[PDB]
Write a protein that binds this DNA or RNA. Structure first.
Lengths: 168, 164
RNA sequence: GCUUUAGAGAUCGUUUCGAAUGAUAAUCGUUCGAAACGUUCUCCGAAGC
Protein backbone atom coordinates (compact mmCIF):
# COMPACT_ATOMS: atom_id res chain seq x y z
CA UNK A 1 0.00 0.00 0.00
CA UNK A 2 0.96 3.65 -0.15
CA UNK A 3 1.85 5.52 3.02
CA UNK A 4 -0.24 8.61 2.26
CA UNK A 5 -3.20 6.50 1.18
CA UNK A 6 -2.82 4.63 4.46
CA UNK A 7 -2.97 7.70 6.72
CA UNK A 8 -6.01 9.12 4.90
CA UNK A 9 -7.59 5.69 5.35
CA UNK A 10 -6.80 5.82 9.07
CA UNK A 11 -8.51 9.21 9.47
CA UNK A 12 -11.43 8.29 7.20
CA UNK A 13 -12.77 6.30 10.15
CA UNK A 14 -13.31 9.56 12.06
CA UNK A 15 -14.65 11.69 9.14
CA UNK A 16 -11.59 13.99 9.41
CA UNK A 17 -8.69 14.48 6.98
CA UNK A 18 -4.98 15.18 7.51
CA UNK A 19 -4.16 18.91 7.31
CA UNK A 20 -0.92 19.47 5.38
CA UNK A 21 1.14 22.64 5.31
CA UNK A 22 4.15 23.09 3.03
CA UNK A 23 6.88 25.72 2.43
CA UNK A 24 9.85 25.84 0.02
CA UNK A 25 13.26 26.78 1.44
CA UNK A 26 16.35 26.18 -0.70
CA UNK A 27 18.47 27.78 -3.37
CA UNK A 28 16.17 28.18 -6.29
CA UNK A 29 17.98 25.34 -8.20
CA UNK A 30 18.36 22.69 -5.49
CA UNK A 31 15.21 23.77 -3.72
CA UNK A 32 13.92 21.72 -0.78
CA UNK A 33 10.30 21.36 0.44
CA UNK A 34 9.29 21.36 4.13
CA UNK A 35 6.02 19.62 4.84
CA UNK A 36 4.02 19.27 8.05
CA UNK A 37 0.79 17.35 8.66
CA UNK A 38 -1.72 17.46 11.52
CA UNK A 39 -4.66 15.21 12.31
CA UNK A 40 -7.15 15.94 15.09
CA UNK A 41 -7.48 14.94 18.00
CA UNK A 42 -3.64 14.86 18.13
CA UNK A 43 -1.30 17.71 19.03
CA UNK A 44 1.82 16.26 17.36
CA UNK A 45 2.91 17.64 13.97
CA UNK A 46 4.65 15.25 11.56
CA UNK A 47 7.34 16.71 9.33
CA UNK A 48 9.11 15.71 6.12
CA UNK A 49 11.57 17.10 3.56
CA UNK A 50 12.34 16.35 -0.07
CA UNK A 51 13.30 17.97 -3.36
CA UNK A 52 9.65 17.80 -4.49
CA UNK A 53 6.40 18.19 -2.60
CA UNK A 54 4.76 14.80 -3.34
CA UNK A 55 7.67 13.05 -1.60
CA UNK A 56 7.81 15.62 1.17
CA UNK A 57 4.15 14.82 1.81
CA UNK A 58 4.89 11.13 2.28
CA UNK A 59 7.98 11.49 4.47
CA UNK A 60 5.78 13.62 6.73
CA UNK A 61 3.06 10.94 6.55
CA UNK A 62 5.41 8.12 7.55
CA UNK A 63 6.64 10.26 10.46
CA UNK A 64 3.07 10.76 11.67
CA UNK A 65 2.60 7.00 11.35
CA UNK A 66 5.81 6.53 13.33
CA UNK A 67 4.29 8.73 16.06
CA UNK A 68 1.08 6.71 16.24
CA UNK A 69 3.21 3.58 16.29
CA UNK A 70 5.31 5.30 19.01
CA UNK A 71 2.34 6.36 21.18
CA UNK A 72 0.82 2.92 20.57
CA UNK A 73 -2.20 4.13 18.61
CA UNK A 74 -1.08 1.68 15.88
CA UNK A 75 0.84 -1.58 15.81
CA UNK A 76 3.87 -2.10 13.59
CA UNK A 77 2.21 -5.05 11.79
CA UNK A 78 -0.62 -2.93 10.31
CA UNK A 79 1.98 -0.74 8.53
CA UNK A 80 3.57 -1.45 5.11
CA UNK A 81 6.81 -0.52 3.28
CA UNK A 82 -37.39 20.43 -14.89
CA UNK A 83 -38.79 18.24 -17.69
CA UNK A 84 -40.57 15.99 -15.26
CA UNK A 85 -37.90 16.38 -12.54
CA UNK A 86 -35.09 14.55 -14.32
CA UNK A 87 -31.62 16.11 -14.09
CA UNK A 88 -27.90 15.28 -14.03
CA UNK A 89 -27.86 14.06 -10.42
CA UNK A 90 -30.58 11.54 -11.25
CA UNK A 91 -30.71 10.77 -15.00
CA UNK A 92 -27.64 8.56 -15.40
CA UNK A 93 -28.58 6.28 -12.49
CA UNK A 94 -32.10 6.17 -13.92
CA UNK A 95 -31.04 5.30 -17.46
CA UNK A 96 -28.82 2.61 -15.99
CA UNK A 97 -31.90 0.97 -14.47
CA UNK A 98 -33.65 1.17 -17.85
CA UNK A 99 -30.55 -0.26 -19.53
CA UNK A 100 -30.35 -3.21 -17.14
CA UNK A 101 -34.12 -3.83 -17.29
CA UNK A 102 -34.28 -4.04 -21.10
CA UNK A 103 -30.90 -5.79 -21.52
CA UNK A 104 -29.51 -2.92 -23.58
CA UNK A 105 -25.94 -4.11 -23.54
CA UNK A 106 -24.67 -1.24 -25.75
CA UNK A 107 -22.65 1.42 -23.98
CA UNK A 108 -21.52 5.02 -24.33
CA UNK A 109 -19.13 5.78 -27.18
CA UNK A 110 -16.74 8.64 -26.40
CA UNK A 111 -14.90 10.94 -28.76
CA UNK A 112 -12.13 13.33 -27.69
CA UNK A 113 -12.56 17.07 -28.05
CA UNK A 114 -9.88 19.73 -28.01
CA UNK A 115 -6.21 19.38 -27.21
CA UNK A 116 -4.78 16.95 -24.68
CA UNK A 117 -4.04 19.75 -22.16
CA UNK A 118 -7.68 20.86 -22.44
CA UNK A 119 -9.43 17.60 -23.21
CA UNK A 120 -13.19 17.22 -23.10
CA UNK A 121 -15.49 14.55 -24.51
CA UNK A 122 -18.69 13.69 -26.25
CA UNK A 123 -20.75 10.79 -24.98
CA UNK A 124 -23.04 9.06 -27.50
CA UNK A 125 -25.69 6.42 -26.90
CA UNK A 126 -28.83 5.26 -28.67
CA UNK A 127 -31.65 3.21 -27.18
CA UNK A 128 -34.05 1.36 -29.44
CA UNK A 129 -37.59 1.14 -28.04
CA UNK A 130 -39.36 -1.85 -29.65
CA UNK A 131 -42.69 -0.87 -28.07
CA UNK A 132 -42.78 2.23 -30.27
CA UNK A 133 -40.43 0.89 -32.98
CA UNK A 134 -38.22 3.87 -32.57
CA UNK A 135 -34.71 5.01 -31.54
CA UNK A 136 -33.81 7.88 -29.24
CA UNK A 137 -30.21 9.07 -29.30
CA UNK A 138 -28.00 11.72 -27.72
CA UNK A 139 -24.50 13.12 -28.19
CA UNK A 140 -23.62 15.51 -25.39
CA UNK A 141 -20.40 17.21 -24.35
CA UNK A 142 -18.76 16.99 -20.97
CA UNK A 143 -15.53 17.94 -19.27
CA UNK A 144 -14.69 14.27 -18.86
CA UNK A 145 -16.23 10.97 -19.90
CA UNK A 146 -18.21 10.62 -16.69
CA UNK A 147 -19.61 14.15 -16.98
CA UNK A 148 -20.27 13.65 -20.69
CA UNK A 149 -22.02 10.31 -20.09
CA UNK A 150 -24.45 11.94 -17.64
CA UNK A 151 -25.55 14.79 -19.92
CA UNK A 152 -25.93 12.09 -22.57
CA UNK A 153 -28.05 9.96 -20.21
CA UNK A 154 -29.95 13.11 -19.23
CA UNK A 155 -30.87 13.81 -22.84
CA UNK A 156 -31.95 10.18 -23.25
CA UNK A 157 -34.03 9.94 -20.09
CA UNK A 158 -35.82 13.19 -20.95
CA UNK A 159 -36.74 12.01 -24.43
CA UNK A 160 -37.87 8.69 -22.95
CA UNK A 161 -39.87 10.50 -20.30
CA UNK A 162 -41.56 12.53 -23.07
CA UNK A 163 -42.74 9.19 -24.54
CA UNK A 164 -44.33 7.66 -21.40
CA UNK A 165 -41.69 4.94 -21.36
CA UNK A 166 -40.35 6.43 -18.09
CA UNK A 167 -41.97 7.93 -14.92
CA UNK A 168 -40.59 11.14 -13.31
CA UNK B 1 -5.22 29.20 -18.84
CA UNK B 2 -7.02 28.30 -15.64
CA UNK B 3 -7.33 30.72 -12.75
CA UNK B 4 -5.04 28.90 -10.33
CA UNK B 5 -2.16 28.21 -12.70
CA UNK B 6 -2.49 31.93 -13.44
CA UNK B 7 -2.07 32.85 -9.79
CA UNK B 8 0.99 30.62 -9.62
CA UNK B 9 2.52 31.98 -12.84
CA UNK B 10 1.96 35.49 -11.43
CA UNK B 11 3.73 34.50 -8.20
CA UNK B 12 6.70 32.90 -9.94
CA UNK B 13 7.35 36.45 -11.16
CA UNK B 14 8.61 37.02 -7.57
CA UNK B 15 9.87 33.55 -6.51
CA UNK B 16 7.04 33.65 -3.97
CA UNK B 17 4.43 30.87 -3.69
CA UNK B 18 0.68 30.85 -2.88
CA UNK B 19 -0.35 29.16 0.37
CA UNK B 20 -3.57 27.18 0.68
CA UNK B 21 -5.50 25.98 3.70
CA UNK B 22 -8.38 23.60 3.17
CA UNK B 23 -11.00 22.29 5.57
CA UNK B 24 -14.29 20.38 5.36
CA UNK B 25 -17.57 21.78 6.61
CA UNK B 26 -20.95 20.05 6.39
CA UNK B 27 -21.84 16.58 7.72
CA UNK B 28 -22.01 13.22 5.94
CA UNK B 29 -25.22 13.90 3.98
CA UNK B 30 -24.02 17.38 2.86
CA UNK B 31 -20.27 17.98 3.28
CA UNK B 32 -18.47 20.94 1.70
CA UNK B 33 -14.95 22.36 1.35
CA UNK B 34 -13.68 25.77 2.51
CA UNK B 35 -10.43 26.98 0.95
CA UNK B 36 -8.41 30.02 2.04
CA UNK B 37 -5.45 31.42 0.12
CA UNK B 38 -2.69 33.95 0.87
CA UNK B 39 0.08 35.49 -1.21
CA UNK B 40 2.72 37.23 0.94
CA UNK B 41 2.89 40.06 1.80
CA UNK B 42 -0.75 40.90 0.94
CA UNK B 43 -2.99 40.79 4.00
CA UNK B 44 -5.96 39.70 1.83
CA UNK B 45 -7.48 36.26 2.27
CA UNK B 46 -9.05 34.66 -0.77
CA UNK B 47 -12.06 32.52 0.08
CA UNK B 48 -13.81 29.95 -2.03
CA UNK B 49 -15.93 26.94 -1.31
CA UNK B 50 -17.84 24.13 -2.97
CA UNK B 51 -18.68 20.44 -2.91
CA UNK B 52 -15.17 19.47 -4.04
CA UNK B 53 -11.61 20.57 -3.27
CA UNK B 54 -10.38 21.63 -6.71
CA UNK B 55 -13.36 23.90 -7.30
CA UNK B 56 -12.97 25.30 -3.79
CA UNK B 57 -9.37 26.35 -4.54
CA UNK B 58 -10.21 27.76 -7.96
CA UNK B 59 -12.87 29.88 -6.27
CA UNK B 60 -10.31 30.96 -3.66
CA UNK B 61 -7.90 31.93 -6.45
CA UNK B 62 -10.56 33.78 -8.49
CA UNK B 63 -11.42 35.70 -5.35
CA UNK B 64 -7.79 36.54 -4.65
CA UNK B 65 -7.12 37.59 -8.24
CA UNK B 66 -10.30 39.70 -8.19
CA UNK B 67 -8.69 41.38 -5.21
CA UNK B 68 -5.39 41.98 -6.97
CA UNK B 69 -7.17 43.78 -9.81
CA UNK B 70 -9.16 45.96 -7.39
CA UNK B 71 -5.90 46.92 -5.65
CA UNK B 72 -4.04 47.57 -8.91
CA UNK B 73 -1.44 44.78 -9.09
CA UNK B 74 -3.25 43.23 -12.11
CA UNK B 75 -5.43 44.50 -14.97
CA UNK B 76 -8.72 42.78 -15.97
CA UNK B 77 -7.46 42.06 -19.48
CA UNK B 78 -4.49 40.16 -18.03
CA UNK B 79 -6.80 37.72 -16.23
CA UNK B 80 -8.63 34.78 -17.89
CA UNK B 81 -12.38 34.17 -17.47
CA UNK B 82 27.75 7.50 -26.09
CA UNK B 83 24.84 7.18 -23.72
CA UNK B 84 21.25 8.31 -23.39
CA UNK B 85 22.33 11.64 -21.86
CA UNK B 86 24.45 12.82 -24.80
CA UNK B 87 22.83 10.59 -27.44
CA UNK B 88 19.86 12.83 -28.12
CA UNK B 89 21.86 16.07 -28.07
CA UNK B 90 24.32 14.70 -30.67
CA UNK B 91 21.69 13.15 -32.91
CA UNK B 92 19.63 16.34 -33.30
CA UNK B 93 22.52 18.17 -34.92
CA UNK B 94 23.39 15.28 -37.25
CA UNK B 95 19.70 15.52 -38.16
CA UNK B 96 20.04 19.35 -38.18
CA UNK B 97 22.30 19.54 -41.24
CA UNK B 98 20.44 17.05 -43.48
CA UNK B 99 17.05 18.87 -43.13
CA UNK B 100 15.55 15.55 -41.99
CA UNK B 101 12.17 16.74 -40.70
CA UNK B 102 11.17 13.18 -39.72
CA UNK B 103 10.52 12.88 -35.96
CA UNK B 104 10.00 9.99 -33.54
CA UNK B 105 6.95 7.83 -34.22
CA UNK B 106 5.54 6.62 -30.89
CA UNK B 107 3.31 3.63 -30.27
CA UNK B 108 1.52 3.03 -26.93
CA UNK B 109 1.45 -0.64 -25.94
CA UNK B 110 0.25 -2.52 -22.87
CA UNK B 111 -2.62 -1.66 -20.54
CA UNK B 112 -3.41 2.01 -20.13
CA UNK B 113 -2.51 1.80 -16.45
CA UNK B 114 0.96 0.40 -17.24
CA UNK B 115 1.97 1.74 -20.65
CA UNK B 116 5.10 1.19 -22.60
CA UNK B 117 5.99 3.21 -25.69
CA UNK B 118 7.73 2.10 -28.86
CA UNK B 119 9.81 4.89 -30.41
CA UNK B 120 10.90 4.60 -34.03
CA UNK B 121 12.93 6.90 -36.27
CA UNK B 122 14.76 6.29 -39.54
CA UNK B 123 17.48 8.43 -41.13
CA UNK B 124 18.15 8.04 -44.86
CA UNK B 125 21.89 8.68 -44.43
CA UNK B 126 23.49 9.30 -47.85
CA UNK B 127 27.11 8.43 -46.94
CA UNK B 128 26.22 4.84 -47.43
CA UNK B 129 22.72 4.44 -48.82
CA UNK B 130 21.65 2.14 -46.12
CA UNK B 131 18.83 3.90 -44.27
CA UNK B 132 19.54 3.44 -40.56
CA UNK B 133 16.64 2.79 -38.18
CA UNK B 134 16.10 2.49 -34.41
CA UNK B 135 13.18 0.82 -32.62
CA UNK B 136 13.42 1.14 -28.84
CA UNK B 137 10.99 1.30 -25.93
CA UNK B 138 10.49 2.89 -22.54
CA UNK B 139 7.76 3.33 -19.94
CA UNK B 140 7.29 6.93 -21.15
CA UNK B 141 7.90 8.77 -24.39
CA UNK B 142 11.02 10.68 -23.29
CA UNK B 143 12.77 7.48 -22.13
CA UNK B 144 11.75 5.74 -25.33
CA UNK B 145 13.05 8.73 -27.30
CA UNK B 146 16.45 8.62 -25.59
CA UNK B 147 16.91 4.85 -26.01
CA UNK B 148 15.79 5.29 -29.61
CA UNK B 149 18.16 8.25 -30.12
CA UNK B 150 20.94 6.25 -28.48
CA UNK B 151 20.54 3.21 -30.74
CA UNK B 152 20.85 5.48 -33.76
CA UNK B 153 24.00 7.20 -32.50
CA UNK B 154 25.69 3.94 -31.47
CA UNK B 155 24.85 2.64 -34.94
CA UNK B 156 27.06 5.38 -36.42
CA UNK B 157 29.92 5.56 -33.93
CA UNK B 158 30.27 1.90 -34.94
CA UNK B 159 30.05 2.82 -38.63
CA UNK B 160 32.50 5.74 -38.17
CA UNK B 161 30.25 8.78 -38.67
CA UNK B 162 30.40 10.12 -35.11
CA UNK B 163 33.45 11.11 -33.06
CA UNK B 164 32.91 9.57 -29.55
C1' G C 1 17.34 26.88 -30.62
C1' C C 2 19.06 21.84 -28.82
C1' U C 3 20.85 18.70 -24.64
C1' U C 4 21.43 17.20 -19.28
C1' U C 5 19.46 18.25 -14.53
C1' A C 6 16.33 20.26 -9.48
C1' G C 7 11.31 22.01 -9.57
C1' A C 8 5.88 24.04 -9.89
C1' G C 9 0.81 24.18 -11.85
C1' A C 10 -3.11 22.59 -15.07
C1' U C 11 -5.25 18.55 -18.37
C1' C C 12 -7.16 13.79 -19.53
C1' G C 13 -7.06 8.27 -19.58
C1' U C 14 -6.56 3.56 -17.32
C1' U C 15 -6.00 1.06 -12.85
C1' U C 16 -6.55 0.64 -7.37
C1' C C 17 -8.05 1.56 -2.20
C1' G C 18 -11.36 4.20 1.37
C1' A C 19 -15.73 7.17 3.14
C1' A C 20 -20.81 7.80 2.23
C1' U C 21 -25.71 7.08 0.29
C1' G C 22 -33.43 -11.68 5.25
C1' A C 23 -29.06 -13.24 3.02
C1' U C 24 -25.39 -15.64 -1.12
C1' A C 25 -23.08 -14.41 -5.13
C1' A C 26 -23.07 -11.66 -9.92
C1' U C 27 -23.53 -7.23 -12.46
C1' C C 28 -24.01 -2.13 -13.74
C1' G C 29 -24.02 2.79 -11.48
C1' U C 30 -24.35 8.04 -8.00
C1' U C 31 -21.47 11.87 -4.37
C1' C C 32 -16.57 12.85 -1.81
C1' G C 33 -11.50 11.68 -0.78
C1' A C 34 -6.63 9.26 -1.59
C1' A C 35 -3.06 6.46 -4.52
C1' A C 36 -0.40 3.92 -9.07
C1' C C 37 1.23 4.34 -14.23
C1' G C 38 0.98 7.60 -18.03
C1' U C 39 -0.42 11.67 -22.22
C1' U C 40 -0.68 16.91 -23.30
C1' C C 41 0.21 22.34 -22.32
C1' U C 42 2.06 26.54 -19.49
C1' C C 43 5.67 28.36 -15.85
C1' C C 44 10.61 27.89 -14.06
C1' G C 45 16.17 27.48 -11.30
C1' A C 46 20.87 25.52 -12.75
C1' A C 47 24.60 23.22 -16.29
C1' G C 48 26.56 22.29 -21.36
C1' C C 49 26.57 23.91 -26.89
Amino acid sequence: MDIKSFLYQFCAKSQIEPKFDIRQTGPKNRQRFLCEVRVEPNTYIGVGNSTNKKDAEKNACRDFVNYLVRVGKLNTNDVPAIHGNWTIENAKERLNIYKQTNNIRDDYKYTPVGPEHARSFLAELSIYVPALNRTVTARESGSNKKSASKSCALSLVRQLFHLNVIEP
